[PDB]
Amino acid sequence: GIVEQCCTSICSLYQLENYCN
Amino acid sequence: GIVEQCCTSICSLYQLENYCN
Amino acid sequence: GIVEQCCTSICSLYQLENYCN
Amino acid sequence: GIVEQCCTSICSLYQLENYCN
Amino acid sequence: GIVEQCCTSICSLYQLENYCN
Amino acid sequence: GIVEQCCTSICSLYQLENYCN
Amino acid sequence: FVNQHLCXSHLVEALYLVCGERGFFYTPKT
Amino acid sequence: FVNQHLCXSHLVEALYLVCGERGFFYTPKT
Amino acid sequence: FVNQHLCXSHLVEALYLVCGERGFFYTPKT
Amino acid sequence: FVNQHLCXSHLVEALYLVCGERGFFYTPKT
Amino acid sequence: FVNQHLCXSHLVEALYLVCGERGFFYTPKT
Amino acid sequence: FVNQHLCXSHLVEALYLVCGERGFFYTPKT
Numbered sequence: 001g002i003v004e005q006c007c008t009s010i011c012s013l014y015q016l017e018n019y020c021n
Numbered sequence: 022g023i024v025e026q027c028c029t030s031i032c033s034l035y036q037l038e039n040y041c042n
Numbered sequence: 043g044i045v046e047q048c049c050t051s052i053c054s055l056y057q058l059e060n061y062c063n
Numbered sequence: 064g065i066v067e068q069c070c071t072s073i074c075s076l077y078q079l080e081n082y083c084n
Numbered sequence: 085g086i087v088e089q090c091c092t093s094i095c096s097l098y099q100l101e102n103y104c105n
Numbered sequence: 106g107i108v109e110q111c112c113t114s115i116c117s118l119y120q121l122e123n124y125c126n
Numbered sequence: 127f128v129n130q131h132l133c134x135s136h137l138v139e140a141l142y143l144v145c146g147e148r149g150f151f152y153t154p155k156t
Numbered sequence: 157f158v159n160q161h162l163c164x165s166h167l168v169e170a171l172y173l174v175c176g177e178r179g180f181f182y183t184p185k186t
Numbered sequence: 187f188v189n190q191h192l193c194x195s196h197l198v199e200a201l202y203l204v205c206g207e208r209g210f211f212y213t214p215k216t
Numbered sequence: 217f218v219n220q221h222l223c224x225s226h227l228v229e230a231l232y233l234v235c236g237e238r239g240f241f242y243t244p245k246t
Numbered sequence: 247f248v249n250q251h252l253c254x255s256h257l258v259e260a261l262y263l264v265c266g267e268r269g270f271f272y273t274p275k276t
Numbered sequence: 277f278v279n280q281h282l283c284x285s286h287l288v289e290a291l292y293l294v295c296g297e298r299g300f301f302y303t304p305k306t
């Protein structure tokens with residue numbers, strides 16, 4: 001759940017790269 | 022009132038086309 | 043049109059104000 | 064790719080729908 | 085504090101020009 | 106300037122970081 | 127299609143995409 | 157080379173900040 | 187002349203409004 | 217002109233339009 | 247790096263910038 | 277052919293996500 005992870009919580013450049021290809 | 026309609030409520034692609042020309 | 047007037051040359055905030063209501 | 068199909072010519076909302084899930 | 089000024093309050097075109105160079 | 110350095114070629118997040126504070 | 131409250135800037139860019147060629151009118155009476 | 161289309165996105169955004177509560181009508185071609 | 191890059195920003199935005207809760211995968215090159 | 221709380225991304229794009237040529241500085245001290 | 251709740255349109259444009267060439271997948275399960 | 281202007285919009289957006297709380301100064305011409 002990226003929404004719960006990055007929009008319902010805080011997201012560093014790294015917790016954001018996980019959702020890349 | 023598009024604001025009341027699309028921002029204060031939900032707006033499907035159709036309730037959005039009404040505001041077109 | 044405004045597309046031709048502002049997408050070829052840069053309009054200003056004052057120029058853009060003509061297109062309001 | 065979609066970059067070549069939509070950044071050269073304008074895709075429509077219907078054309079863009081093919082790329083969904 | 086522009087955040088406190090323009091996001092935590094209202095900002096007219098003028099209270100916004102102050103933050104220009 | 107950055108306009109010349111990033112609007113002609115694609116800068117990276119690492120390149121863009123030089124321009125921060 | 128998206129199911130969420132579309133507001134200000136987002137609302138306008140969305141009208142832009144749907145109407146495309148037709149164009150649109152934006153009047154925030156609320 | 158769909159420049160004009162990308163540009164329209166930025167115009168309406170700008171029109172939106174500039175007109176405010178007065179609103180506007182977007183009509184690409186006359 | 188980094189056009190393609192600027193265009194990708196507008197596509198994903200559009201893909202986002204169009205796909206909604208269905209989501210999507212963005213893959214520039216095949 | 218717009219009358220609303222301008223925040224994050226919107227706040228920056230707005231400074232961009234007003235200042236235009238002059239440029240601007242963004243420092244979120246809150 | 248930014249420290250704030252990134253949502254909808256902003257969230258997508260951000261994934262776009264980080265992943266860049268790699269690309270990304272967006273699936274709002276919430 | 278106002279490319280550079282459209283590009284500046286995307287840069288500041290990017291600068292905004294990248295700098296975060298550190299902020300930045302945007303100065304087009306040296």
Ligand SMILES: [Cl-]
Pocket residue numbers: 162163192193282283
């Ligand atoms: Cl663009």
Ligand SMILES: [Cl-]
Pocket residue numbers: none
């Ligand atoms: Cl927002």
Ligand SMILES: [Zn+2]
Pocket residue numbers: 135136225226255256
């Ligand atoms: Zn937003």
Ligand SMILES: [Zn+2]
Pocket residue numbers: 162165166192195196282285286
């Ligand atoms: Zn753009």
